[PDB]
């Protein structure tokens, strides 16, 4: 059963798309053929179509039908190209319709069948060289521009069926005559100057087929048909790929609709660009439908944010999803124009690659803040021990297995890492700058304490035998370990702030020097020291044996000797001075307001004040007097 694709009011049939869908399976693609038969009314057109292609047009607009089977001398044959057939009746008057219908047929058909009667071959009378000339014109206008400018090999086959052939004239003889009439008419056709050189054969192939008298030789007529079949489908002698219009079957209705609308409204129809447009439209909607198949298929994974992040197991789902999309797209779209098809595939690629990249970023720095957290941790756990290097080694393996782990889910480099490492880097550097200040300050603090611990034991030893050179001995030691700190830190320096860790480490030192001297030489200690010096000479022998006073010359004179021995030490301990007589001045004037806690008025060298010295002397005397009185009550 046949469908009218164009009725007499030049309207295009809406049902065509569904009609094509029924007769053509998803399989066809480019392997189909369009054949048109073109002629004035009742010249055997529907009859030839029904007998040859087995199609059901009515025998006494434009009608389309699928051919289930071709009539051949090998019987009913199904070619494996789908064959569609158009019955084009250009007259019923009108000359406008004729031109339009012929334009349609030539913009969609690979073969044009022209039925001409014999005794009337070579004459409008019962051929229409008027009809052929229209075909020549319509063909030139459709393909003359392409042919000149690209030299494309496109042709259409003219298949001339000679009807009611009797046989006194051989078909070979009729063919030669008619061929030369054809070329002649072509040469004389109005052409632009620059196509003047093109011939009939640059646009057309011809061949002939004689059919015997339908009414008077029915058996032979049947046979001649079957033989046309052999030519079409059994011997595949007629169809050629250079006749084929490059639009797969699924784009065909769109192509036919667009061609007809331009034709009907007298617009400039250009078939190359119209074929590109249908390809572009169709690949586009395959891109979109596939990309939507890829998406609810996506969501049902990726804001399911998930438990245990495996990077190779699903770094390859990325591949699967993207590969299955490629395959559903290749299936429908590869039939289309190569350039259009690949272009829109890339479009599909960089739509998939961008919603796959949002999972890329999430699972990525979830692993960065997972690894930065433990980075940060055993930095601290590496308790300041040689971070000279031990930053560089830790950053290295870190920055490295991020690369490894995350590469698993990039696609041979499609989703770039350049962004993510550039972040992981700055989050690593801005946290060595974190704890560099911690460990810089840390080595300051402990360097200060066993400075002060050494200072304290230096002073203590010196206290046993105070000389006018005991401050010398104290400052010597101090300034010694004072200059042994710096440039030796196992960190990233800052030539500047390596050395201003140093710079008042040098303070806290000066500060400590003051604090320790004043602790170790407080009134209370000084007094205790004085009593010890005193007893050493008043309570014991040189030997160290407890003393036994007999006389009071003995007591009184060693009493004087004991006191002086003790007090000879006061002028030295109450004020920090070297033998030269010079006051010890701290390098930094401490007790300064913001010179103090910029780094975290008294006298630094005054160990004991006047007022304190006077209290010490009063207390020294009272005690020393008592020891005296007693050891004299025990002499009697």
Ligand X SMILES: Nc1nc2c(ncn2[C@@H]2O[C@H](COP(=O)(O)OP(=O)(O)O)[C@@H](O)[C@H]2O)c(=O)[nH]1
Interaction residues for ligand X, span 44-103 (CB under 6 A) = 44-47, 59-60
Q: Could you say which of Mg ion, ligand X, none residue 388 binds, taking C-beta under 5 to 8 angstroms by partner kind?
A: none
Stated as kind and residue range, the H or E segment containing 156 is: strand 156-165
Contact flag: residue 215 with ligand X (CB under 6 A): yes
Token representation of residue 281 = 């439209």
CB 290 within 8 A of CB 328: yes
Nearer to Mg ion, 4 or 442 (CB): 4
- Tell me how far the alpha carbon of residue 529 is from its chain's centroid: 80
> Which residue's CB is nearer to ligand X, number 41 or number 582?
41
Do the Cβ atoms of 95 and 45 come closer than 8 Å? Answer: no
Question: Which does residue 509 touch among ligand X, Mg ion, none (CB within 5 to 8 A, set by kind)?
Answer: none
Q: How many CB atoms lie within 10 A of CB 627?
A: 16
Cα angle: 307, vertex 309, 315; to 5 degrees = 135
With residue 164 as reference, give the H or E element that holds it. strand 156-165
Shortest spacing between CB 35 and Mg ion, in angstroms: 15
What is the bridge-based pairing of β-strands 82-89 and 62-66?
Answer: antiparallel
Going by C-alpha positions, the residue among 140, 135, 166 that lies closest to residue 40 is 135
Q: Do the annotations mark residue 274 as ligand-binding?
A: no
Residue among 8 and 625 whose Cβ is closer to ligand X: 8
Judged on CB neighbours under 10 Å (0-12, 13-18, 19+), 42 is: exposed
Q: Please tell me whether 280 is known to bind a ligand.
A: no
Q: Report the partner that residue 430 touches, choosing among Mg ion, ligand X, none (CB closer than 5 to 8 A by kind).
A: none
Residue with the two structure tokens 């040098």: 506
Residues contacting 54, CB < 8 A, separation 6+? 67, 68, 69, 70, 71, 76
HSE-up of residue 88 (Cα within 13 Å, Cβ side)? 29
Collapsing DSSP to helix, strand or coil, 41 comes out as: coil
**Residue 44 marked in a binding site:** yes
| Dihedral sign (CA 20, 24, 30, 36) | negative
Nearer to ligand X, 48 or 290 (CB): 48
Q: Is 146 annotated as a binding residue?
A: no
> In the bound complex, what is the minimum distance in angstroms from residue 242's beta carbon to ligand X?
29
Q: Restricting to residues 34-53, which ones interact with Mg ion according to CB under 5 A?
A: 45-46
Residues 133-192 that bind ligand X (CB under 6 A): 163-164
Report in angstroms how near the CB of residue 49 gets to ligand X at its nearest.
Answer: 7
| Candidates 42-50, 308-316, 560-568, 580-588; binding stretch for ligand X (CB under 6 A) | 42-50
Using the contact rule CB under 6 A, the part of the chain among 10-18, 208-216, 466-474, 532-540 near ligand X is 208-216
Asked if 605 and 577 touch (Cβ cutoff 8 Å), the reply is yes
**What DSSP line would sit under 180-220, residue for residue?**
HHHHHHHHHS---GGGTT--HHHHEEEEEEEEE-TTT-HHH
Q: Which does 410 bind (CB under 5 to 8 A by kind): ligand X, Mg ion, none?
A: none
> Is 42 annotated to bind ligand?
yes
39 annotated as a binding-site residue: yes
Output 215 or 308, the one with its CB closest to ligand X: 215
Query: Is there binding between residue 115 and Mg ion (CB under 5 A)?
Result: no
Number of residues that bind ligand X (CB under 6 A): 16
Query: 34: helix, coil or strand?
Result: strand
Partner from Mg ion, ligand X, none contacting 215, C-beta within 5 to 8 A by type: ligand X
Provide, rounded to whole angstroms, the least separation between the CB of residue 169 and ligand X: 17
Return phi, psi of residue 327, to 5°: -80, -35
Q: How many residues bind Mg ion (CB under 5 A)?
A: 2
Interacting stretch for ligand X, rule CB under 6 A, among 1-9, 40-48, 293-301, 332-340?
Answer: 40-48
Write down the least CB distance from residue 3 to ligand X, Å: 16
Choose the one of ligand X, Mg ion, none that binds residue 71, judging by a C-beta under 5 to 8 angstroms depending on kind: none
The answer to whether 315 is annotated as binding is no
Least separation in angstroms between residue 221's CB and ligand X is: 7
Question: Which residues define the annotated binding site?
Answer: 39-46
Which residues sit in the known binding site for GTP? Answer: 39-46
Q: Site residues (CB under 6 A) for ligand X?
A: 39, 41-47, 59-60, 163-164, 211, 213-215
Binding site for Mg ion (CB under 5 A): 45-46
């Amino acid at each position: 059963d046949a469908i009218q694709i164009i009725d007499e009011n030049k309207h295009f049939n809406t049902g065509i798309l569904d009609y094509i869908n029924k007769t053509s399976p998803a399989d066809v693609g480019n392997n189909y053929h369009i054949i048109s038969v073109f002629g004035s009314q009742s010249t055997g057109k529907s009859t030839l179509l029904n007998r040859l292609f087995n199609t059901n047009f009515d025998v006494m607009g434009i009608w389309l039908a699928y051919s289930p089977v071709v009539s051949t001398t090998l019987g009913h044959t199904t070619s494996k190209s789908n064959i569609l057939v158009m019955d084009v009746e250009g007259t019923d008057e009108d000359q406008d319709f004729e031109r339009k219908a012929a334009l349609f047929a030539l913009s969609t058909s690979e073969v044009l069948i022209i039925n001409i009667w014999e005794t009337q071959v070579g004459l409008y009378q019962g051929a229409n060289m008027g009809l052929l000339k229209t075909v020549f014109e319509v063909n030139l206008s459709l393909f003359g521009k392409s042919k000149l400018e690209t030299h494309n090999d496109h042709k259409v086959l003219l298949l001339i069926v000679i009807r009611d052939h009797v046989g006194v004239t051989p078909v070979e003889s009729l063919a030669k005559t008619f061929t030369l009439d054809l070329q002649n008419m072509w040469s004389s056709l109005a052409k632009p100057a620059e196509l003047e050189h093109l011939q009939f054969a640059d646009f057309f192939d011809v061949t002939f087929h004689a059919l015997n008298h339908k009414v008077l030789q029915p058996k032979e007529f049947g046979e001649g048909i079957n033989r046309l079949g052999d030519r079409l489908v059994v011997s595949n002698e007629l169809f050629k790929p250079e006749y084929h219009h490059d639009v797969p079957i699924d784009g065909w209705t769109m192509y036919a609709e667009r061609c007809w609308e331009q034709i009907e409204t007298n617009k400039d129809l250009d078939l190359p660009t119209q074929q590109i447009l249908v390809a572009q439209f169709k690949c586009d909607e395959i891109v979109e439908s596939v990309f939507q198949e890829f998406l609810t298929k996506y969501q049902h994974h990726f804001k399911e944010v998930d438990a245990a992040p495996d990077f190779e197991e699903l770094g390859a789902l990325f591949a699967d999803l993207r590969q299955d999309a490629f395959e559903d797209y290749d299936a429908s779209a590869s039939r289309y124009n190569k350039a259009v098809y690949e272009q829109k595939r890339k479009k599909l690629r960089w739509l998939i690659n961008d919603k796959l990249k949002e999972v890329f970023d999430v699972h990525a720095k979830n692993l960065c803040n997972t690894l930065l957290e433990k980075f940060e941790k055993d930095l601290v756990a590496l308790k300041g021990k040689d971070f000279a290097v031990n930053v560089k080694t830790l950053s290295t393996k870190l920055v490295e297995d991020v690369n490894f782990q995350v590469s698993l889910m990039s696609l041979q480099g499609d989703l770039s890492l350049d962004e993510i490492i550039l972040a992981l880097t700055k989050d690593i550097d801005a946290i060595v700058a974190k704890q560099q200040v911690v460990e810089l300050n840390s080595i300051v603090n402990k360097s200060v304490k066993k400075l002060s611990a050494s200072l304290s034991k230096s002073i203590q030893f010196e206290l046993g035998d105070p000389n006018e050179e005991t401050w010398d001995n104290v400052l010597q030691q101090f300034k010694g370990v004072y200059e042994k700190f710096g440039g030796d830190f196992g960190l990233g320096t800052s030539s500047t702030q390596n050395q201003q860790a140093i710079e008042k480490f040098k303070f806290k030192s000066w500060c400590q020097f003051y604090d320790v001297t004043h602790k170790l030489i407080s009134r209370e200690k000084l007094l205790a020291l004085l009593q010890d010096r005193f007893d050493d000479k008043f309570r014991y022998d040189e030997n160290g044996l407890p003393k036994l006073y007999l006389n009071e010359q003995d007591l009184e004179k060693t009493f004087a000797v004991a006191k002086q021995h003790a007090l000879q030490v006061l002028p030295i301990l109450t004020f920090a001075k070297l033998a030269d007589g010079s006051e010890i001045v701290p390098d930094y004037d401490i007790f300064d307001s913001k010179l103090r806690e910029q780094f975290l008025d008294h006298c630094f060298a005054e160990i004991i004040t006047e007022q304190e010295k006077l209290e010490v002397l009063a207390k020294f005397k009272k005690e020393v007097d008592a020891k005296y009185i007693e050891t004299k009550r025990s002499i009697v």
